[PDB]
Scaffold this active site. Sequence first.
Site, PDB file in Angstrom:
ATOM      1  N   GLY A 215       0.768  -1.250   0.000  1.00 25.99           N
ATOM      2  CA  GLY A 215       0.000   0.000   0.000  1.00 25.99           C
ATOM      3  C   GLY A 215       0.792   1.289   0.000  1.00 25.99           C
ATOM      4  N   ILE A 216       0.115   2.381  -0.370  1.00 24.56           N
ATOM      5  CA  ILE A 216       0.640   3.747  -0.197  1.00 24.56           C
ATOM      6  C   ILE A 216       1.373   3.825   1.133  1.00 24.56           C
ATOM      7  CG2 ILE A 216      -1.019   5.192  -1.543  1.00 24.56           C
ATOM      8  CD1 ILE A 216      -2.443   5.485   1.303  1.00 24.56           C
ATOM      9  N   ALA A 218       5.502   4.786   3.113  1.00 25.03           N
ATOM     10  CA  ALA A 218       6.953   4.601   3.081  1.00 25.03           C
ATOM     11  C   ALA A 218       7.370   3.133   3.226  1.00 25.03           C
ATOM     12  CB  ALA A 218       7.647   5.489   4.163  1.00 25.03           C
ATOM     13  N   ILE A 219       6.868   2.471   4.278  1.00 29.42           N
ATOM     14  CA  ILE A 219       7.384   1.149   4.720  1.00 29.42           C
ATOM     15  C   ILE A 219       7.555  -0.002   3.676  1.00 29.42           C
ATOM     16  CG2 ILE A 219       6.692  -0.872   6.167  1.00 29.42           C
ATOM     17  CD1 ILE A 219       8.707   1.663   7.285  1.00 29.42           C
ATOM     18  N   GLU A 238      -3.009  -2.892  -5.352  1.00 29.42           N
ATOM     19  CA  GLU A 238      -3.540  -1.568  -5.674  1.00 29.42           C
ATOM     20  C   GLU A 238      -2.649  -0.791  -6.629  1.00 29.42           C
ATOM     21  OE1 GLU A 238      -6.148   0.958  -2.588  1.00 29.42           O
ATOM     22  OE2 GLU A 238      -4.435   1.647  -3.763  1.00 29.42           O
ATOM     23  N   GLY A 336      -7.404   1.248   0.373  1.00 25.54           N
ATOM     24  CA  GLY A 336      -7.527  -0.180   0.158  1.00 25.54           C
ATOM     25  C   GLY A 336      -7.052  -1.030   1.316  1.00 25.54           C
TER      26      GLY A 336
END
Length: 447
Positions: A215-216, A218-219, A238, A336
């Site tokens: 997902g969106i 940094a990690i 996504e 998401g």
Amino acid sequence: MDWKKIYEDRTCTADEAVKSIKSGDRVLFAHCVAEPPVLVEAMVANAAAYKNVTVSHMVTLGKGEYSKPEYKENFTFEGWFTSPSTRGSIAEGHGQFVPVFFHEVPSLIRKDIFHVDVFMVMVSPPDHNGFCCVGVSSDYTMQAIKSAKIVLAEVNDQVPVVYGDTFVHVSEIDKFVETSHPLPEIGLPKIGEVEAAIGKHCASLIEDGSTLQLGIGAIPDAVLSQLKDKKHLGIHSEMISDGVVDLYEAGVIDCSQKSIDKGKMAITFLMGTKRLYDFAANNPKVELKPVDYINHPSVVAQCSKMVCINACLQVDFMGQIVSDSIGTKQFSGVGGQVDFVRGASMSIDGKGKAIIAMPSVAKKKDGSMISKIVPFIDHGAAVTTSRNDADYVVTEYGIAEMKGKSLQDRARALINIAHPDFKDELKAEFEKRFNAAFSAWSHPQFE
Ligand SMILES: CC(C)(COP(=O)(O)OP(=O)(O)OC[C@H]1O[C@@H](n2cnc3c(N)ncnc32)[C@H](O)[C@@H]1OP(=O)(O)O)[C@@H](O)C(=O)NCCC(=O)NCCS
């Protein structure tokens, strides 16, 4: 034959195009990197002609100019997801925010809950048959096209042709503005010590032939750098970013082991540097699809050995997961996150896993350390991923299992994975909360 006259006849300037928008209108933007900047700046520039035009969209890399206070009588920002340049307004009270699962967006449009009077889109120029490509999105962008009463296209020759449901025939578009400019780009994150540690732990839960979502945030990148020993990994996600490209040319990701969309990276949208858009262009191993496919719980449930990996802001002692707000301040959205928590759980193969990851600590402004592991969420926060949805949670210090584990045992796991300098305060908080000793079995050697 007819399509070129249609195209030639509907070609105008950004200024006249934005004159299709009237007062009272709901206006929506193409998602993310398909936001038309010239068509947007034109609309802002002509502010003083509109009264309460709703401006909807999701994550944005533009200036969010329409959401500023001065414009409060021409535009109402109504975000479905927020970002640095538009959540100002939700805080100040004039901007709006709507909580929606990302996969539900197309449906609500079809239903006419999200009614659209003017969708503005950036697409590439027509091919020999007159089909412009969005290239970089599909998400809700495809449904909005079919459903918008008026569609403005900011035709930009820098946009790639990317396979999938990325196509729109010129006959579906009311006005065209030709431009030429580079697409926007995000920075790579700093993969430090904490980032690297979160990485390898997620890497101990991915088995060879896993399909991934990242997902969106940094990690999920430090993760990707820890995946080099993995084999036959597949993609259903996504989005994917530059990190996914590295792993793909390092031979790790090949989608040779998926059950649906075999051989392809299946994504709903792209965000990254230009290396990513260029890679995705005219590439058989990438297919963009609509979100009410990609994010759909029923569809994700069909993926093989699915490992979802997303991020959060904080987690509490019951394993309630907060991912888009800091107290009463809205910061992003579910997007998401939950779509893939639901789908990994429903896995048909029984092997699904969802991983929510986060640093154990965060710095404040006064420079005080705070635990992202808490007894209780911040006053007025939104539970993003509910306790019943919770699965794996992951910090620099370890992994904790929330699925089928009691309130007391979850709190024990999380305290486990917390910054040592907070464990003891967390332990006191345990005993207060639960009216039970932190440590379960007790030894005669003492009292
Ligand atoms: C969780 C999420 C907000 C984090 O994104 P990110 O860019 O990695 O966010 P960060 O870790 O930088 O956190 C933002 C800032 O808030 C701060 N912060 C983080 N957790 C905090 C907490 N519990 N309390 C107070 N502040 C906190 C951090 O200090 C950070 O730094 P900054 O203030 O210096 O900018 C983002 O991944 C998201 O929006 N997730 C929900 C949507 C999702 O999962 N979607 C899947 C779609 S692909």
